[model samples]
Target: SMEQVAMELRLTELTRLLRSVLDQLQDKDPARIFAQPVSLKEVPDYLDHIKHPMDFATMRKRLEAQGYKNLHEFEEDFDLIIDNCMKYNARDTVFYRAAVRLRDQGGVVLRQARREVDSIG
Candidate 1:
């Protein structure tokens, strides 16, 4: 019983995070991928269990640069990406598709969109 509930929670959270990651990536720039190719790995480190290494890596970096300081930051974009992805994929399993993408191809293109905030003129 405990295992079932625990696994369910993990699946839900991972799925939610995956959707958020995909939505952010698509909105940023699906045309070419990360503008500057973020190499750093944080969330990727935690997501090593997944099948997609490169994809997970991309999303991790993009999510971080997107200003997601911690893990929960993903929840902020949860609704945005899901709404759009499902809007198009409603005929199919959009959330599932986005989750796979996030779990596979990850982010890029506009990933390097961040510019220095404040500095001496």
Candidate 2:
């Protein structure tokens, strides 16, 4: 574990290693092997463009308990539908249903706003 962590730390400081390699390869009177314009500038930029997987901090929280309670409270509703789907091979309970509901609600709000805007115009 300690060795792995150390290796990762070294890798994280990749620019340092790159500079060291370039220095060793270009000892004052060495051959012009590195004739091209070598730079570490783009290395960081390329790495920054790479996206990492989620840390799941948001997934751990509830967008559940904030809204008003309906027929079944958050946990009760979640467990009921999730358990039913889990054991029964039912897949259509959440994803598209929630998406479409949100879409329709958003459409309603936006349409009302557009009506107000049209009136103003």
Candidate 3:
């Protein structure tokens, strides 16, 4: 069906755009801390501070599962990843600084993706 084809095309493009954004974040994270979920053993208070935990791996899995309805939902996860880090760590800490950098860089990536997707229609 044409509708099915159109939906598939939209999902394929969205996946590509989302993956590109993720790749950029992963590449920027030299410490690799944001690549996976935070270990409670390593940081017990993390859960206490961050009620909603998120990471690149989780995002990747969710993307593959087609959990995101749109770019806005994807961006929410992206923001949560950074926001959780910043909320848990002090401003002077490396984690906080890394989160700040990701926020700035990821903003640009998201904007670019939005523009690219908008132009497709």
Candidate 4:
């Protein structure tokens, strides 16, 4: 379960960092920080379609391992992958290149857990 544990740690780090940034923004610039608003959202009855950064990275590494070379090539493809992944409600439909490549080398992340569980026994 190292992957899972490591994944949690990474998430914790990210959450802390993001939270810290938000907190700082709130104190320094509340107007800009709280400008955006959120509305009521609903979770599906059968909530199981989340993804993890590790899983996506696994697949991404697969592609890179398969046939990806150079930062420029990886960066371009990586952007597309991020776009597709962000589009999904729960799952990252795309992997490799951009989704994980660009923002991945610094640290490993765990994708949203729900997406990772889909279609699994």
Per-candidate clashes, comma-separated: 5, 0, 0, 15
Residue 48 displacement (Å), model 3: 2.1
- Given candidate 1, what's the lDDT at residue 57? 43
Local distance difference test values of all predictions, in order: 0.41, 0.33, 0.86, 0.35
Q: Candidate 4's C-alpha lDDT?
A: 0.35
Q: What is the lDDT of residue 20 in candidate 4?
A: 36
Better of 1 and 4 by lDDT: 1
lDDT of 3 by residue, 1-121 (tens): 9999889888887887777877887787888879899999988887778899999999999998767768889989988999888888899998899999988887887888888778874
> Which residue segments of model 3 deviate by more than 4 Å?
none
Top candidate when judged by lDDT against the true structure: 3
**For each candidate, what TM-score against the reference?**
0.27, 0.23, 0.90, 0.27
- Between 2 and 4, whose TM-score is larger? 4
lDDT of 4 by residue, 14-68 (tens): 4444333323323332223122221124534212433322223333444434333
Candidate 2 lDDT by residue in tens digits, 5-59: 8755544443333333223323321333123322237445422432321111221
Best by TM-score: 3
Q: Residue 116 error for model 4, in Å?
A: 28
Alpha carbon lDDT at 61, candidate 2: 29
True-structure Cα RMSD, model 4? 16.1
* Runs with alpha carbons beyond 4 Å of true place in candidate 4: 30-121
Error of 2 at 88 (Å): 21
